[PDB]
Structure 1
Amino acid sequence: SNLLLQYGSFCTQLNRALTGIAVEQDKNTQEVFAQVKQIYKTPPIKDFG
């Protein structure tokens, strides 16, 4: 660890890239599924012709 202390920039950029990917996954899910702002409920009656 004391030897690796001089590669802090390399580790910081690695963790930054991975954190960006991780946030991007949640963003992708939000764009795909969270388009509708209201949670509509199915009607009790299913008279859909």
Structure 2
Amino acid sequence: TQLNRALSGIAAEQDRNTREVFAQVKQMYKTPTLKYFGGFNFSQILPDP
């Protein structure tokens, strides 16, 4: 009983470590079709839809 509380206690922080990094974002924005914002090319950084 004490072992599974230890590994699931480790496993629960691996969710907390990922949410404290990526999930700082309140809202989902769309992918812009514009990709030269003044000649700054951005197809490699944006997802290719």
* TM-score using structure 2 length: 0.64
1:37 maps to 26
Structure 1 or 2: more helix by fraction: 1
Instruction: Give the % identical residues.
Output: 79
Per the TM alignment, residue 29 of structure 1 is displaced from its structure 2 partner at its CA by: 0.7
Following TM superposition, the consecutive aligned residue runs of length 4 or more in structure 1 with deviations greater than 6 angstroms are none
| Structure 1 alignment gaps of length 5 or more | 1-11
Per the TM alignment, residue 44 of structure 1 is displaced from its structure 2 partner at its CA by: 1.4
| Structure 2 alignment gaps of length 5 or more | 39-49
Q: Does 1:17 align with 2:6?
A: yes
State the structure with bigger RCO (CA 8 A, min sep 6), 1 or 2.
2
1:6-27 C-alpha deviation (Å, 9 max, x unpaired) = xxxxxx1111010111110011
RMSD (Å) for aligned C-alpha atoms: 1.1
The aligned length equals 38
Q: Distance in 2 between matches of 1:31 and 1:40?
A: 20
* TM-score using structure 1 length: 0.64
